Amino acid sequence: NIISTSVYVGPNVYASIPLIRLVIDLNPHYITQLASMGSEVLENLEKVIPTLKTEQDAKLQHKLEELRQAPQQQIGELVAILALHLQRLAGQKGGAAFSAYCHEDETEILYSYESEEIGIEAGEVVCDMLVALAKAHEAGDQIDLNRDVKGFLRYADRFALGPSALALVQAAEERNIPWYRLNDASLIQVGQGKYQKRIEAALTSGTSHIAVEIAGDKNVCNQLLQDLGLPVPKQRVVYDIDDAVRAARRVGFPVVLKPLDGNHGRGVSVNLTTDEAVEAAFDIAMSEGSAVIVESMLYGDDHRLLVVNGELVAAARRVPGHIVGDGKHNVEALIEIVNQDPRRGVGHENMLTKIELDEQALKLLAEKGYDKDSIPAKDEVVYLRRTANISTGGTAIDVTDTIHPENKLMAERAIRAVGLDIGAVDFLTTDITKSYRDIGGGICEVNAGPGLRMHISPSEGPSRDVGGKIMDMLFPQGSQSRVPIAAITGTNGKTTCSRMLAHILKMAGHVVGQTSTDAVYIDGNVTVKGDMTGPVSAKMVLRDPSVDIAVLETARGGIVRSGLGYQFCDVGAVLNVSSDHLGLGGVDTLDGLAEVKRVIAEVTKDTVVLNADNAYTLKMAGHSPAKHIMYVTRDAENKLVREHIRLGKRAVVLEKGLNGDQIVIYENGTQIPLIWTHLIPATLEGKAIHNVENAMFAAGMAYALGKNLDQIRIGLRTF
Amino acid sequence: NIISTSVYVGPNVYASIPLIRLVIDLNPHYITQLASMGSEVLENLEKVIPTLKTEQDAKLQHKLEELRQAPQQQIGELVAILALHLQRLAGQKGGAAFSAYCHEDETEILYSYESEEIGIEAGEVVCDMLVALAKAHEAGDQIDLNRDVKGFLRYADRFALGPSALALVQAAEERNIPWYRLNDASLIQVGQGKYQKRIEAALTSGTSHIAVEIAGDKNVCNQLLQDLGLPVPKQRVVYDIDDAVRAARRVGFPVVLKPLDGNHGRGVSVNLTTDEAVEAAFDIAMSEGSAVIVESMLYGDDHRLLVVNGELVAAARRVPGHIVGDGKHNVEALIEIVNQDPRRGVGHENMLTKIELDEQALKLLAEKGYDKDSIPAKDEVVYLRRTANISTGGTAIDVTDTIHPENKLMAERAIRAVGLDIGAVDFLTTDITKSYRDIGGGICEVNAGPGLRMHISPSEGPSRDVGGKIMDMLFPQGSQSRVPIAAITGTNGKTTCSRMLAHILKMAGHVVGQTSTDAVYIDGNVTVKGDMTGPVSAKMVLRDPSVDIAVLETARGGIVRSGLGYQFCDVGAVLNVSSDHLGLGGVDTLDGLAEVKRVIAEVTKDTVVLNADNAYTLKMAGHSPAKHIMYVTRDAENKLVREHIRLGKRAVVLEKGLNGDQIVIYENGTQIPLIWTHLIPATLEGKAIHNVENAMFAAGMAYALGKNLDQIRIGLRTF
Ligand SMILES: Nc1ncnc2c1ncn2[C@@H]1O[C@H](COP(=O)(O)OP(=O)(O)OP(=O)(O)O)[C@@H](O)[C@H]1O
Ligand SMILES: Nc1ncnc2c1ncn2[C@@H]1O[C@H](COP(=O)(O)OP(=O)(O)OP(=O)(O)O)[C@@H](O)[C@H]1O
């Protein structure tokens, strides 16, 4: 039903938001189609996309669809209402949607959603559901619409960060810091230039290539681990199968044949104690033809000790699925019983696997002497899995709190020898609460950068905030700057005010960047110039690993089409944007332009500097979250000084006196003269209009950014 | 000829050194075989292993083989003389060799060589050359012996660090810091625990896994590079060949088909401007079936800008081999002429390739209209290579000094966006001295971690110390500790003196490690115990990334078999080692034991603490490089106080007085009482002998390591 698309990357319309433009082909629309579309249009939506429920918490700012059924669907608005909930079904985040009806026979839906990759399409599924339902033979809910829904969800998953990365994303958001998808797939960037880090789940910018390659190199790790005195099996001396038999003789006959390379499943042979057992196993386990290492067998369960900043933050005991007898039920009946655990299944909530008597389970129960219908002795255990897994597993039943301090220390040491920040040592033991002295080669692998899917939200015991523990050593409370100060002016004197502010901040000693449609400027030089519509100039400054302050300087053309390239700022300014000429088209008087200028004022949180001589800019003070206002006036006689400063607010006032033409910053109970117009090259020799307000605004911006007077006067005089 | 082997890892015999034990099967040895063995035995050695030359600089401490010919070869000694030179031929480093003749009919060769992997075997080749020559029909030099030599050299190369790593090794040695082969192959560790880094040529511990994976990911790099505003071709939008033709249409028809994945050679199609040209090229260039990316063609030569710590340290212009006409010679004749360049060939010195009119060259000369026998116009150029290479190339003719500052800046920015410390930006341009504004997409690849074989020792222009520039940002002069203080006592009170010293250093605030045959102790805990013969206890402490001071504590059994696990120390000590019991066997009086104790005294460079009551330990002062001596005496009446301290030397003297039994450290012009024996638990309540000298020695060691008196008294009292 969709004809055209656009996206606001910034808050042109309150927050970043995609726009869907649709046309009604179904001229005899919902208002004249209620025979085949009664209450069931809503009931059908509840089943086709089962997030579209009568849930009071489902972004229900306005409870409208339940009052409309078919006669008043107002499909353009209904698509906006139903849009985003499909994305919630896919595990995506988003907000409200609104004001979809526009021109006759057309819709422009504004709906708030975090990702562009599946943007619009979610509304495609929704608008087609509503029209397709009308265009159907009273066919019910999941006519064919459930196909489109599942397809969408798969795509939404395709472009999603995995759960191990989402753990860090949520942890970043909860510490109030921004992030980006940086490398596609699961890698994100947290923070902005100068302070930012590229991180991917259990992988950080602090961990080197060498440490990771070492971690992958099992032969190297075993030697490095031995060099620490760790409790390791060592014995990595056998390549392939050493022509058979000899390979076990060299490490001791009771061996395990560990699969290597790409063997996905576990082509592992176990408990082989004779020449025949190993000779047969060697060419079975090495099913890849060249992917086996021969090690002696040690006994213990499968533990994982996840260490981040030295500290053990999580642990797991990846016990393979099994059954324990209750004294009455047989092996097969127990499987049916195990599968009644409400946490098992597929989709959301169901994080555990199911047990079936498949070939792996069958070989194991056969090894134990079972034909499936017999009854295990009470408390007898038969394993139906060889080890771990997430989809065929999901077991995670360990603790970090009862583990003997020395086992924790040996795991830390293993990680340090490699040089990793994050890893979960693969540790085998019969008793994790005893020291390593009784654990026969418990450390087997360093396991660098484990999926957190195996630690977060465990099957037993308390959970641990693995996401937060990782973020704590990346963006600690000990370092408060994660972002540059956002200090952005409006669609104004981007070629003069901007120079004065950049000079102030550079002379102050900050690295400052801006792009006044010209090549992007970082400190003393530039790169790319162009149609700086918003997101380009912003990422070119914000992601540049040098910048302390982001000024950017916006433009009206960019904003009306894309919004801002950033979502909010701390500091900003609005100077007059109207003149008797073309602005944005439309009205270009007070109106039209009022909407573009408010984009900066309403997103500024601390100090917005407003032009006090513009009666139609003054109104921004009634909307902006910023409270200082810093009214700037070229008229010493005004009301917004005495009825403003006197009440604790700020202003920049041009006045004449002992200091010639001077610009004075007023604040609460005092006032301090800063510059002469007579001394600023931008304003010639004084007695001039052009760039006087630009100098006043640069000073106002400087106030907000930490005026110390002396370096500001230098920056203002510099030009 | 070799029967048995052993190796000293430390200076049991002056420096670390392998030992070869050989037997003479050739009873009618060299002295009775001169008819078939005249001057030519030496002349033959000069040709079989052509490092065995009459070179005055060839470790020629003693010019002996030239005076011996056959009648006095003294083969056990001659093998020691000739050994190591084979290793020099392989590009290996080593020293002197000596004292090979031992028991009748047997040899024990001591020869100094850096690696164990090809140790002994080099002497195997040599001892067999000498015997095999005698056992031959006056057969000359390279009978079959040259086979064994070439085999050896190939093995020596197999276990060698590559030239790009050797660049860092030599740079590390020239800054006086130790290193180890850590990960086999080319990776080394420079420095010791607490200060050490794992580095591999153009790869350091400071560069993360994420930065390297990004560098390898060409699609990601092009987007990250575009986000900086770099002069890049971008256009990484085509997967495979996009079903043919369309792929070029999408980027512009004038395209280059760049090979991907494992394509070793250059399956690149160029200058394709039509539908037919690209359709044909697409299935030719993608010879792997799935390894092509389609990009538009940009013009320029192949430049590499190697950046390490921001700074451009080297550059190369990898101009493919070509010929330029001189107005007289044809293409084929010019090839013969080019190949007369003395730098071209194989082996040592010959670092450039040779030109042949092979298929690559032939296609290129055919494209230019040549049949090989025609004459190019003067200064006309025909390329006989598509690009670069080391073995089929070796061209490196750029500079770093004339490159326009902005091209250097764009290369730095490319490296930073990825997050690498080291890389050589792959930059295309027609003129590197002009800014990027005129270079049509010059940055193509980040090229992380390049072989230095393409930058070090260039074919034209000045060389640059790429090795040193890398070491400068790893082990800068701004950080002087690269190693722990080596503070090692002799085969003494390893269970008491050692505790007192460890307590002193821990109470002082240093992390100290030691292994008194017991489990290795690092700070407050331990791991592995065992036959601590030298190298194990040393690497267990020295490579442990926490330790500031390495005490170790040695033992006589370990030293007589392996030497020390370290090569030298700053501080050390010798207490009495003899008693009326078994020591090392042999003599066990003054002798036998004198040789094991001198191992510590003679490798101590600053302060060695000697026992002044032992007339047969005093003699160590005449051999040790250490000059303070710190004579320790339990007898207030001695001569080695008044004739020692008075002359500027140090001592620890036990004396009786106002402070009961006290231990006083004397130094040059003063003396300061430190402890009472009455207050040290090790010495009971005073009026005791056991551990008094151990306390005195711990205090002597503390002196050398920075006594501040107060934390030393605490460490001495602690026990
Ligand atoms: N000496 C040993 N004794 C007992 N079991 C061993 C021994 N060596 C290896 N194993 C088993 O082999 C398993 C290795 O499985 P594999 O490496 O294929 O799993 P994966 O899915 O690749 O994950 P990971 O590498 O983290 O184990 C260990 O988890 C352990 O159960
Ligand atoms: N747009 C282009 N215009 C001209 N030549 C190009 C273009 N893109 C790639 N090339 C050529 O393709 C070459 C790439 O060769 P290839 O990547 O196979 O070499 P390599 O041996 O793997 O080393 P490297 O990756 O460092 O280039 C570049 O060196 C350059 O000569």
| 3-state per-residue secondary structure call for B640-675 | CCCCCHHHCCEEEEEEEECCEEEEEEEECCEEEEEE
| Judgement on whether residues B500 and B582 belong to the same structural domain of the protein | yes
- A579 domain residue, yes or no: yes
CB atoms within 10 A of CB A581: 6
| Judgement on whether residues B642 and B493 belong to the same structural domain of the protein | yes
Q: Output Rg (C-alpha) for chain B, integer angstroms.
A: 33
Quote the tokens at residue B342: 């003395």
**Is the minimum CB–CB distance between A540 and chain B shorter than 8 Å?**
yes
Nearest by CB to residue A203, choosing from B209, B406, B419, is B209
Which of B47, B182, B568 has the alpha carbon at shortest distance from A419?
B182
Interface of B with A in 413-452 (CB under 8 A): 413, 416, 419
* Residue B269 CB partners (closer than 8 Å, separation 6+): B256, B257, B281, B282, B284, B285
| Judgement on whether residues B132 and B168 belong to the same structural domain of the protein | no
CB B97 within 8 A of CB B60: no
Domain range enclosing A677: 485-717
Task: Note whether B229 contacts A205, CB cutoff 8 Å.
Answer: no
Give the CATH number of the domain where residue A252 resides: 3.30.1490.20
Q: Which helix (H) or strand (E) holds B335?
A: helix B331-338
| Judgement on whether residues B450 and B492 belong to the same structural domain of the protein | no
Q: Output Rg (C-alpha) for chain A, integer angstroms.
A: 33
* Distance in angstroms (rounded) separating the CA atoms of residues B674 and B691: 16
Q: Is B296 annotated as a binding residue?
A: yes
- A405 domain residue, yes or no: no
What b/e readout covers B472-498, taking b as 16+ CB neighbours within 10 angstroms? bebbeeeeeebbbbbbbbbbbbbebbb
CB atoms within 10 A of CB A184: 13
* Residue A540 CB partners (closer than 8 Å, separation 6+): A513, A515, A520, A527, A528, B227, B228, B229
Whether ligand 1 lies within 6 angstroms of the CB of A272 is answered as no
| Judgement on whether residues B9 and B126 belong to the same structural domain of the protein | yes
| Judgement on whether residues A69 and A9 belong to the same structural domain of the protein | yes
Nearest residue on chain A to B208, alpha-carbon basis: A208
* Residue B435 CB partners (closer than 8 Å, separation 6+): B404, B406, B407
* Distance in angstroms (rounded) separating the CA atoms of residues A560 and A538: 16
- A205 domain residue, yes or no: yes
Which domain-ending residue is among A176, A193, A209? A209
Locate the DSSP E strands across A515-568: 521-522, 525-526, 549-552
How far, in whole angstroms, is CA B708 from its chain's centroid? 37
**Residue whose CA is at the smallest distance from ligand 2 atom 23:** B447
Environment class of residue A600 by beta-carbon count within 10 Å: exposed (0-12), middle (13-18) or buried (19+)?
Answer: buried
Q: Is the dihedral of CA B179, B183, B186, B187 positive or negative?
A: negative
Task: Note whether B204 contacts A210, CB cutoff 8 Å.
Answer: yes
In the numeric block, the tokens 């086996």 are attached to A292
- B361 domain residue, yes or no: yes
- A400 domain residue, yes or no: no
| Judgement on whether residues A146 and A9 belong to the same structural domain of the protein | yes
Half-sphere exposure of A710 (CA within 13 A, CB side): 1
| Judgement on whether residues B522 and B489 belong to the same structural domain of the protein | yes
| Judgement on whether residues B265 and B354 belong to the same structural domain of the protein | no
DSSP lists the bridge partners of residue B253 as none
DSSP string, B604-641: EEEEEEEBTT-TTTGGGGGT-S-----EEES-SS-STT
Q: Which of B208, B234, B527, B544 to mutate to test the interface with A (most CBs of A within 10 A)?
A: B208
Nearest by CB to residue A210, choosing from B184, B203, B419, is B203
Please provide residue A686's backbone torsions phi and psi, each rounded to the nearest 5 degrees: 90, 180
DSSP lists the bridge partners of residue B19 as B6, B110
Q: Is the dihedral of CA A365, A368, A369, A370 positive or negative?
A: negative
Whether ligand 1 lies within 6 angstroms of the CB of A389 is answered as no
CB B411 within 8 A of CB B443: yes
**Which ligand has the minimum distance to the alpha carbon of residue B449?**
2
Q: Give the method used.
A: cryo-EM
How close A229 comes to chain B (CA, Å)? 5
| Judgement on whether residues B284 and B312 belong to the same structural domain of the protein | no
- B352 domain residue, yes or no: yes
Alpha-helix runs per DSSP H in A331-436:
331-338, 359-367, 405-418
| Judgement on whether residues A269 and A143 belong to the same structural domain of the protein | no
* Distance in angstroms (rounded) separating the CA atoms of residues A639 and A633: 10
CA–CA–CA angle A225, A230, A231 (5° rounding) = 120
* Residue B443 CB partners (closer than 8 Å, separation 6+): B225, B230, B231, B232, B410, B411, B414, B425, B426, B427
Which domain-ending residue is among A158, A173, A194? A158
* Mutation pick for ligand 2 pocket among B294, B426, B444 (CB with most ligand atoms within 8 Å): B444
- B657 domain residue, yes or no: yes
| A-chain residues near B525 (CB < 8 A) | 406, 409
Which domain-ending residue is among B257, B281, B296? B296
How close B487 comes to chain A (CA, Å)? 21
* Residue A174 CB partners (closer than 8 Å, separation 6+): A468
**How many angstroms separate the most distant Cα atoms in chain B?**
106
| B-chain residues near A216 (CB < 8 A) | none
Whether ligand 1 lies within 6 angstroms of the CB of A268 is answered as yes
CA–CA–CA angle B235, B238, B244 (5° rounding) = 125
| B-chain residues near A199 (CB < 8 A) | 210
* Distance in angstroms (rounded) separating the CA atoms of residues A675 and A666: 13
**Residue whose CA is at the smallest distance from ligand 1 atom 13:** A258
In the numeric block, the tokens 């099996």 are attached to A233
Task: Note whether B210 contacts A199, CB cutoff 8 Å.
Answer: yes
* Residue A279 CB partners (closer than 8 Å, separation 6+): A244, A245
**Is the minimum CB–CB distance between B211 and chain A shorter than 8 Å?**
yes
Q: Which helix (H) or strand (E) holds B169?
A: helix B163-173
Environment class of residue B104 by beta-carbon count within 10 Å: exposed (0-12), middle (13-18) or buried (19+)?
Answer: exposed
How far, in whole angstroms, is CA B494 from its chain's centroid? 33
Resolution in angstroms for this experimental structure?
A: 4.4
* Mutation pick for ligand 1 pocket among A256, A257, A269 (CB with most ligand atoms within 8 Å): A256
Give the CATH number of the domain where residue B580 resides: 3.40.1190.10
CB A655 within 8 A of CB A672: no
Residue at A329: amino acid letter = H
CB B413 within 8 A of CB B381: no
Q: Which helix (H) or strand (E) holds B164?
A: helix B163-173
Alpha-helix runs per DSSP H in A159-187:
163-173
Quote the tokens at residue B650: 């140090």
**Lining residues, ligand 2, CB within 6 Å:** B 233, 256, 258-259, 266, 268, 295, 297-298, 302, 387, 426, 444-445, 447
* Distance in angstroms (rounded) separating the CA atoms of residues B372 and B360: 14
* Distance in angstroms (rounded) separating the CA atoms of residues A666 and A640: 11
CB A60 within 8 A of CB A74: no
Report the domain count for chain A: 4
Task: Note whether B183 contacts A214, CB cutoff 8 Å.
Answer: yes
CB B466 within 8 A of CB B402: no
- B356 domain residue, yes or no: yes
DSSP string, A99-147: --B-STTEEEEEEEES-STTTTHHHHHHHHHHHHHHSSSS--S-SSHHH
| Judgement on whether residues B463 and B528 belong to the same structural domain of the protein | no
Task: Note whether A183 contacts B217, CB cutoff 8 Å.
Answer: yes
CB B234 within 8 A of CB B201: no
**Which ligand has the minimum distance to the alpha carbon of residue A294?**
1
CB B644 within 8 A of CB B629: yes
Distances (CA, A) of B59 to A177, A571, B88, B115: 64, 73, 11, 18
| B-chain residues near A416 (CB < 8 A) | 545
